[PDB]
């Protein structure tokens, strides 16, 4: 508020939203103009300090005063980083006389940071439909049996000496004595998914479908691939897939949709002809003969029983990617008829790939997270984007996936376990996603969220797969002990946060479930109606996100972190809208004075809480709103 040898952190702000960055996804020829907010008349000088990888050196760009915001409460300073194809990282040095502060991806700091700088990755682009959409994940066998004739029946077939077992819809997922949990089937198929597209694209509003494995495999999950080129008969055939894809892409049954498939490229099942451990094919697999034409596709320590596999599971023999140009890299992604390209090109034209166990992909049986792994995912990107620049690549990773995204040469994003699923779980349910006791306060939540966002480039952040739960962790509804209000709170946050809101089938109505396989229960369609509280909220929240671009690609600013009342408030805003989200994580209601002046909401102007429908007036930079415990409001204008 004045030149007093003091930089006020509360008035400072910057991120790569439209108000502060004119080129979030620049090419080699586009310069980047940045704006830094501060309280009006608070500083004396500011400078942009950026590291240029082309020059392995720091560069300085003094900033100049640009303007004030409509409310005359803040100043905006600007500076431009020149154009070039090189990746750069920047931070701000902010001075007010004898007071100096720094600011980067992690926010304000008294001392200069050495990490979490903002990213500038020329020519790096993630599909905008991914940044702006809402995803719905489906575990095929448990969503909807659209065709009873292709159902796996009890004893239909055997796998490793165990018969398959069919279950009545709604029954327990656990295998009865004599059967295996991996061979329990309910009948869910592609025809069913197709027949329920209205529910997904209209009742809910989700425009993106992500499916767990659908290719030929003996198990329930099908991560033990037997044939990447054929849809498993239990789910239909390749034509059944084409029809589904066309109906998903169609706008005659709702909004234009996108299809993302699960790509299991680190390994195959042990029954794949390349391996053929049980001799299910006349051809000779690697397990059968060292003269097998596919022998080299795998790594044997002691042929044929000891070989590299996924975490020791013999049913999952690991693929050897060898050096560039290898036959394996060829069948998986380089060949026009490879698994990756086949489904991306017509007559399929799917829209993306979810990369299973992506961190392990490697050569000679090694375990990835190395130079070879990253080289492979680099060529993978080239192969994919070369066929469809708008095809999504989302790798599976439970920690900081910066290594596979920050270079702009590998994935578009990743499964946001670390930056979304875990923090949300611990804040709202007091448990980690494994249902183990782990709780965090509101201030910790906000700190966790910011720190994890800072791990990634802005476009990557906006494309992260943010799910409350999935096929590998306990259901949110179980972690919350059945308290549906906790699901309410989780949904409101999910639909208003940075990254692709991802709904694991059932979560929208509060489905429960423990650890795999109980987290893959059949879907109860009588609960699949807005008559169900959670469902109605979901539809409403999705409608809201689609209505406000600021919610998908806008800036994110922390507004309130109250650990006594358990209130968390943040804003999402761009050049058109300003939205203050207010969440009540307490078990009682609270009346909150939201400081919407921080988002520059003019006084006297009104805002509407899209959740309830009630309207409010901005008084003295504030907006007073009463919020129920474990619930929230979305004040937009
Ligand atoms: Ca000052
Ligand atoms: Ca079926
Ligand atoms: Ca054979």
Swiss-Prot record:
GO process annotations (BP): carbohydrate metabolic process
GN (gene name): tvaI
Species: Thermoactinomyces vulgaris
Cofactor(s) for this UniProt protein: Ca(2+)
Superkingdom field: Bacteria
GO cellular component, one term: extracellular region
The protein, known as: Neopullulanase 1
Subcellular location: Secreted
Biological role stated in the UniProt entry: Endohydrolysis of 1,4-alpha-glucosidic linkages in pullulan to form panose. Also hydrolyzes cyclodextrins.
């Amino acid at each position: 508020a004045a030149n007093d040898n003091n930089v006020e952190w509360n008035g400072l702000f910057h991120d790569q939203g439209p108000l502060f960055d004119n080129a979030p996804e620049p090419t080699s020829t586009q310069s980047v103009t940045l704006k830094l907010r501060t309280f009006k008349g608070d500083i004396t000088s500011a400078n942009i300090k950026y590291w240029d990888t082309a020059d392995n050196a720091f560069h300085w760009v003094p900033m100049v005063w640009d303007s004030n915001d409509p409310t005359g409460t803040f100043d905006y300073w600007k500076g431009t980083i020149p154009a070039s194809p090189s990746i750069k990282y920047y931070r701000f040095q902010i001075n007010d006389g004898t007071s100096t502060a720094w600011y980067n991806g992690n926010g304000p700091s008294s001392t200069e940071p050495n990490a979490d700088d903002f990213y500038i990755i020329p020519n790096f682009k993630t599909p905008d439909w991914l940044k702006n959409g809402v995803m719905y994940q489906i575990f095929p066998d448990r969503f909807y049996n659209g065709d009873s004739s292709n159902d796996v029946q009890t004893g239909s077939y055997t796998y490793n000496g165990t018969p398959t077992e069919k279950k009545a819809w709604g029954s327990s997922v656990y295998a009865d004595p004599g059967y295996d949990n991996s061979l329990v089937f309910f009948g869910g198929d592609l025809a069913g998914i197709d027949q329920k597209l209205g529910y997904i694209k209209k009742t809910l509003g989700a425009n993106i479908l992500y499916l767990n494995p659908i290719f030929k495999a003996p198990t329930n999950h099908k991560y033990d691939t037997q044939d990447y080129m054929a849809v498993d008969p239990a789910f239909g055939d390749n034509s059944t897939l084409q029809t589904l894809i066309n109906d998903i892409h169609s706008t005659a049954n709702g909004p234009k949709g996108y299809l993302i498939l699960d790509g299991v490229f680190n390994h195959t099942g042990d029954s794949h002809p390349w391996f053929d451990k049980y001799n299910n094919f006349s051809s000779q697999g690697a397990y059968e003969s060292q003269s097998s034409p596919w022998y080299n596709y795998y790594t044997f320590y002691t042929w044929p029983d000891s070989y590299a596999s996924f975490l020791g599971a013999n049913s999952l023999p690991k693929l050897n990617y060898g050096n560039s140009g290898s036959a394996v890299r060829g069948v998986i992604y380089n060949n026009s008829n490879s698994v990756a390209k086949t489904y991306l090109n017509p007559p399929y034209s799917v829209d993306g790939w979810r990369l299973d166990a992506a961190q392990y992909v490697d050569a000679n049986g090694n375990n990835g997270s190395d130079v070879t792994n990253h080289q492979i995912w680099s060529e993978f990107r080239n192969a994919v984007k070369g066929v469809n620049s708008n095809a999504a690549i989302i790798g599976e990773y439970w920690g900081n996936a910066n290594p596979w995204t920050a270079q702009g040469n590998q994935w578009d994003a990743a499964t946001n376990f670390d930056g979304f699923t875990q923090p949300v779980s611990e804040w709202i349910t007091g448990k980690d996603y494994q249902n183990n006791s782990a709780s965090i306060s509101t201030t910790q939540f906000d700190s966790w969220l910011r720190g994890t966002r800072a791990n990634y480039p802005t476009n990557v952040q906006q494309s992260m797969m943010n799910f409350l739960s999935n096929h590998d962790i306990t259901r949110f509804a179980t972690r919350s002990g059945g308290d549906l209000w906790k699901t309410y709170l989780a949904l409101i946050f999910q639909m208003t946060y940075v990254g692709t809101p991802t709904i694991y089938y059932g979560d929208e109505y509060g489905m429960q479930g423990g650890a795999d396989p109980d987290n893959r229960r059949s879907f109860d369609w009588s609960q699949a109606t807005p008559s169900n509280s959670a469902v109605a909220l979901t539809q409403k929240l999705i409608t809201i996100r689609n209505q406000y671009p600021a919610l998908r690609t806008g800036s994110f600013m922390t507004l309130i972190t109250d650990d006594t009342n358990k209130i968390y408030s943040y804003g999402r805003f761009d050049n058109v809208n300003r939205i203050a989200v207010v969440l009540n994580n307490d078990s009682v209601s609270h009346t909150v004075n939201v400081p919407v002046w921080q988002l520059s909401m003019p006084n006297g102007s009104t805002v509407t809480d899209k959740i309830t429908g009630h309207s409010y007036t901005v008084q003295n930079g504030m907006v007073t709103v009463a919020v129920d415990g474990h619930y929230g409001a979305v004040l937009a204008q």
